[PDB]
Design a binder for this molecule. Structure first.
Ligand code: NI
Ligand code: NI
Ligand code: NI
Length: 103
């Protein structure tokens, strides 16, 4: 985090500057994603329940390994509303970005 089941988030990660999305992950937690520029994605969190955790992965299907992920990062989600920024270039060859709650 820098200063400002599994859902498909490619629309924002691989989108243009200005690309936005919102996902209700459970009854308590909603995550907004906003691509602020070519280098940075902003994550917005609203959590009306207990602390949880957001896990971000990027998936590939390779001939040798089949469906496998690279862990990008994982982030505490405390009660209330907040934000943090991630350094992810949109011009990446990495596709199939996902996020999920730990619990
Ligand atoms: Ni890779
Ligand atoms: Ni996808
Ligand atoms: Ni949950």
């Amino acid at each position: 985090q820098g200063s400002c089941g599994q859902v498909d988030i490619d629309s924002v990660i691989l989108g243009r500057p200005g690309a936005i999305g919102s996902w209700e992950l459970n009854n308590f937690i909603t995550i907004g994603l906003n691509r602020v520029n070519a280098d940075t994605v902003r994550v917005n969190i609203r959590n009306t329940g207990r602390t949880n955790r957001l896990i971000i992965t990027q998936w590939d299907n390779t001939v040798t390994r089949g469906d496998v992920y690279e862990l990008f990062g994982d982030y505490a989600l405390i009660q209330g509303r907040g934000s943090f920024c991630l350094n992810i270039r949109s011009d990446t060859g990495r596709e199939n970005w996902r996020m999920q709650l730990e619990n």
